[PDB]
Symmetry: D2
Subunit: 97 residues, 4 copies
Amino acid sequence: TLRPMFKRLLANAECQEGQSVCFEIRVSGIPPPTLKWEKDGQPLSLGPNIEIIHEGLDYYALHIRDTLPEDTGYYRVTATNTAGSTSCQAHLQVERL
Amino acid sequence: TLRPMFKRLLANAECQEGQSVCFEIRVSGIPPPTLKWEKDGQPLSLGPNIEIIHEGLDYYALHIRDTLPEDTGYYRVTATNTAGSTSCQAHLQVERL
Amino acid sequence: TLRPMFKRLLANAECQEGQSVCFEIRVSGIPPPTLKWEKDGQPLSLGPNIEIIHEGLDYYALHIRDTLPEDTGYYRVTATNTAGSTSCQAHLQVER
Amino acid sequence: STLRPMFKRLLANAECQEGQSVCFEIRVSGIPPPTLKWEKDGQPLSLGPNIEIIHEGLDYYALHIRDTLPEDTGYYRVTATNTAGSTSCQAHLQVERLR
């Protein structure tokens, strides 16, 4: 039994509107923690252009394609299991033109 | 609060070695269920070419690129929340050249 | 100048309907040759769920997603430059 | 029986952060369908391991540059040619340093 711990935290990013952007984390824990994603403190809605990818043992990626100005904001991830919780956030800046 | 429930089950799949294969499910639930994937009864090991994608509201896909014969087997997914659990499975046959 | 040559030829393929399939080739030549693709002797119908990919190391790929039974058939690629031309083909079988 | 190539959607200036991907998208027509040459700053484009050109339908082409480096900054040009003539357009890519 091991509390969830980030091995790789979210990092701030910027992209141009219409382009794609990727955020990435690695989070470990026994049992494998479940994740909750938020934007500006509200539950993240994936919609048509956002996807969450799970690879490897602890690797998760948040991918946005066809980014829009509205996608600008603070993205938070929270990992939880029976032993504890841990959370981090980063900012996405979608630039105009 | 409602028990998790597949709106689209895993379906049996087949591909040629070196090609890609995709399993797709759709599971709803309030609260949104957490998923657990298994291969032949053991916890699924996401290798280098295996990824799990979450899209939309309840869309989940298991993607395997560049399949190898080792990927042959029974894949199971369990969706759990505070109201209960649901599970389904299907078979993947990677055919050699 | 140099005649186009297939460093990797098309190989026969099979896929289940609704899944994806990829045909890969490697073509060299100076000048870099232009490619023309056919299916069953007629120009390849470039529509949804079909894409032609070009990447480094002379790599070219024909990718088809969400295959339908109509996608079964013989796919041919012809490479041509000023020094000549070369062609090869392979079969795709869509299965249920 | 011929028709000079014409851009229906042109390359657009782009910007991305080092390490992210950037995409350029065009639509070009013409009879017979034109062949394309891609250039970076007047030189033929070398795709390396990180660039792929995707052709969909008859007119759509996308230039995907992944794992961008600041040295990728420059002017990218595409030229479409058939037996009836040629047409060309270019855009600028700025790969901003992570710092």
